[model samples]
Target chain A: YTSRIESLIREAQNQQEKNEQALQLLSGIVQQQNNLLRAIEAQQHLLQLTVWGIKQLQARILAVERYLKDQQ
Target chain B: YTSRIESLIREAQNQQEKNEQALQLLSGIVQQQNNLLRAIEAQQHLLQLTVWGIKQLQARILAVERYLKDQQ
Candidate 1:
């Protein structure tokens, strides 16, 4: 039983083209991961700075409360 | 959801690496094909030369046999 492909070269060439396209897409994704890394770094930085600012404000409020009690 | 996203990222990374590797392999195959083509060409030329030489020898042998038979 024979199925319909006449040219091995044509079939192999098509496969090569498909492989090239897939390679290009994967390469693009690798490049895009750099952007993802930047976003992750930004998020982590914001989270850290948020906690630091909150701690500093809490310290200032406690100092103010201590001053008020000393005045009383 | 967490496991799914992790699996998805793993899948993507795995596929990306596989594609990169496959492309490298395919590129190597293309180079090998070039070498293979040259080898095939050399074999074809040698085959043709051998066949032609055999034909020439057979023709000479036939001519010599016919002359000997005529002399008898």
Candidate 2:
């Protein structure tokens, strides 16, 4: 039981790393989303990318979420 | 064990892209919040030092949910 408890605690530490990674990715996407808002509001130059580009940001976020998801 | 997860993440982050773009639509500001909230909700966690960082995430998600709630 001693080793079992120790392993569980070790697993806890591992989870912390994974959680932080997810948070960081979410933070970036959120930040990027905000930046997109500001740029569009300002209407600066109004550049363009394909529709697929929009999904790129979204896919990046989803990909991270799923990776961490399968772990725990 | 999950090399698949790693490759998926690589694909996600791979395109830094040609920049100044995505338009992202005006809608995703609020939409992004909701999407982010869902991802956070989908996550699961664990114990104090290693566990402590995740508790930090707790406060973070709390703040986002509040902002989204009020924004809505």
Pick out the ten consecutive residues of candidate 1 chain B with the lowest summed lDDT: B32-41
lDDT value, residue A18 of candidate 2: 59
Q: Specify the poorest-scoring 10-residue window by lDDT in model 2 chain B.
A: B41-50
Clashing residue pairs, candidate 1?
A: none
By lDDT, the best candidate is: 1
lDDT of 2 by residue, B2-61 (tens): 233233323222221211143343344455445433322322111122245445545655
Report backbone clashes per prediction: 0, 0
- For all candidates, state DockQ relative to the true structure: 0.01, 0.04
lDDT of 1 by residue, B1-72 (tens): 124434544554555565567766544443333332333233334434444554565566556556545776
RMSD of each: 39.8, 23.3
> Which portions of model 2 miss their true places by more than 4 Å?
A1-72, B1-20, B45-72
Per-candidate TM equals: 0.36, 0.20
Among these predictions, the greatest TM-score belongs to 1
